[PDB]
């Protein structure tokens, strides 16, 4: 399968610089065109940059808003594409996807979140939410910055009946919640644990839900 | 820059209904470089149709694309539950490459009442001097819904944070989370905490409450 691993995201103060990397695998990297696309709630989907294959010029192309500040490059020997970003603005905040194009087919990575802000990184606090054929449990993930966090239940094996809600920002701090609904015979008989990862603070917290 | 306009931004549709989404360019776009992407929340956009009318791998046959010059369209013959998603048109005929605003496509289903669950503050959060009361309103349709918090009968609106999920792909319902945050002192000063949900499925609200005792 095609795989595009993105990295280099995180928090940066306005005016600072950051470099995004994308390591490719599963295809002939030298043949593909490599692009960077960005997505934000306010600006939608934005093509950011493109660099074509050696076969047709190796020519870079940029969006108007990033000209002179962003630099796209590629290393075929490492199957990697890079986006250097200088003098970053608040509008640069968003999810950056690395994409590859062969013929008319294209492939997107899972993306990495870039946040341009002067606020400080802070790890999340994970609070258990405990209380009839079904029973609902949850986790409150409060007071973290920046986005994102990932939430699973029992290391991803408990996927049915899960609702992870979008984060809400207030006072430069994010808060979200996650609920899971299970049969009443399974809890507290079987264990239910939420797993919360916050890569920006390099933190992961597991919380087993136990009755009150 | 070629600007693409996808109106309307939101669209509802019946199961089995023929749906059509439009994409209008400010200038001419070569059909070979007009494509459509599908996106579901929490996941990257996926190439859905390339070169105006060619279905990508994995896309069911009920999808089709059409158009030319300055007007393109995506058409679903029989709307199904798994088709509820956002759809973006994209052009790379003239650089810079540009996307449409996207169209949120939602499917209709039989009305369903929310499952409401209330949770008092955890002891861990109390040790830090805060108190959050959580209310989940899960798996309801339609998306229109109201929630309000009551402390000892008095309506509360400060310290409330709401969050909504997009339409579920399997049962086509919606969900909501409401969090009322207080200081530990404020929380200890009252007894009755109430979360009540008003939805199109009942004249009287669904009420869930608890007392600190």
Numbering used by the authors:
A (entry chain H): 1 to 131, 138 to 218
B (entry chain L): 0 to 212
Task: Please give the exact wording used by the authors of the publication that reports this structure.
Polyethylene glycol (PEG) is a water-soluble, low immunogenic and biocompatible polymer formed by repeating units of ethylene glycol. In this regard, we have developed monoclonal antibodies that can bind specifically to PEG for universal detection and quantification of PEGylated drugs by anti-PEG sandwich enzyme-linked immunosorbent assay (ELISA). In this study, we determined the crystal structures of two PEG-specific Fab and one nonspecific Fab in complex with PEG. Both specific Fab/PEG complexes share a similar dimeric binding mode that is very different from that of the nonspecific complex.
The monoclinic crystal of 3.3-Fab/PEG complex contains four Fab fragments in an asymmetric unit. Each Fab comprises the N-terminal VH and CH1 domains of the heavy chain (named H, I, J, K) and the VL and CL domains of the light chain (L, M, N, O). The asymmetric unit can be divided into two pairs of Fab (H/L, I/M and J/N, K/O) related by a non-crystallographic two-fold symmetry. In either pair of the Fab an S-shaped PEG molecule was found at the pseudo-dyad. It binds to the N-terminal side of the Fab, which corresponds to the complementarity determining regions (CDRs), in a symmetrical way. In fact, although the 3.3-Fab/PEG complex crystal did not contain crown ether, some PEG fragments were bound to the side chains of K19(H) in a crown ether-like manner. On each 3.3 Fab molecule, about 605 Å2 (or 3%) of the 19,600 Å2 surface area was buried by the PEG-mediated dimer formation. The heavy chain contributes 445 Å2 surface area, with at least 10 amino acid residues involved, and the light chain contributes 160 Å2, involving at least 6 residues. In fact, the subsequent AUC experiments demonstrated that 3.3-Fab exists as a monomer with a size of about 48 kDa in PEG-free solution but forms a dimer of about 90 kDa in the presence of PEG. Therefore, the observed 3.3-Fab/PEG-550-MME complex was probably made up by two 3.3-Fab bound to a single molecule of PEG-550-MME.
